[model samples]
Target: AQYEDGKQYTTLEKPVAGAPQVLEFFSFFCPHCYQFEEVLHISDNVKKKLPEGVKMTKYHVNFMGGDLGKDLTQAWAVAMALGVEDKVTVPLFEGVQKTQTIRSASDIRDVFINAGIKGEEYDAAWNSFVVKSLVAQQEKAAADVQLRGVPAMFVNGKYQLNPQGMDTSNMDVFVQQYADTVKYLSEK
Candidate 1:
């Protein structure tokens, strides 16, 4: 269980200041990210296993879906703004990846509407300063990371996990090990 910087993680020069932050940079269009959330259920499971005060924050990337990419990121931002992120993320993912029902910003609005958020409410959040700032910040963070791919997780804003370097041969083992790694790095 000994983790090394170049093996399991990479040290960052410009570390974020969340002390115990577990930040994930991902995209809904990424199938691996979908698996991480929907299939293996790492996101939720890790949250349960994390040490106290270790907050996991997700940043939706806008580099993959063409024009739809930024739109999706904005949709994610709006969901966060309205405090309905958990309610909308899976549906939005299904719309984009599974059902193929979402194609544009308006389609995203429909998903939010189905989540019981009025169209007007979605619009308000979409246009609000908080959401706008969030999207901007997400974009900046994504670019700053210079990630090779999606579903990237960083502990305490400095130790970036190397998924390709981890043992993922079994789901249960992977989940527990991943949580333990996050907990270890988060506490450091």
Candidate 2:
């Protein structure tokens, strides 16, 4: 009750996965998620505080972007599979969310192309079974969380982060509180 499970977040009927992990549900189309990633940089802050071996995963929800939602998810999956998420996530966010330059899957391919991923390599990864499987996992995670909004964070599979419940006196405090909360819950 101290975590205000119902008010702040609902414990999933079942944990999405084991402890020492975080699964973030977000969308490039989401303004709040954009701020959480770019402005607040909460994920990086939380990562620095996390114990060793704690994995952080991002799941793109398919509820937005019309038919393009799945395509965007595929793009994200391909980036992760190629181990280029660090190189491509910001670019993808900037192009698609900030400047609205990414209009389709083909445009997303261009983002990766500009990031040094050859077109053929991108095509192979884009159609690879691994990328397809990752995209499927994203969809399953969204269903498992019964996600209602963007920027939703869950630690140890079951403990969800409640940004509204955290101290937000300032940007610094908020980031600290966000990371602390996730770290604390993760250790539990």
The candidate maximizing TM-score is 1
Instruction: Name the lDDT of candidate 1.
Output: 0.82
TM-score of each: 0.91, 0.91
Error of 2 at 127 (Å): 1.3
Note the residue pairs that clash in candidate 1.
none
TM-score of 1: 0.91
> lDDT tens string, model 1, 1-188?
48887877779888766433787877889999888888877777779878776667888997788899899999889877778978988998899999999899999899889889997888888888998898988887766667668888888767888767677788787777777777778778
What tens digits encode model 2's per-residue C-alpha lDDT throughout 50-151? 889888887788888877778999988998899997898788788878889988999899999999999999999999999989898888878876787888
**Model 2 global lDDT (CA atoms, 0 to 1):** 0.83
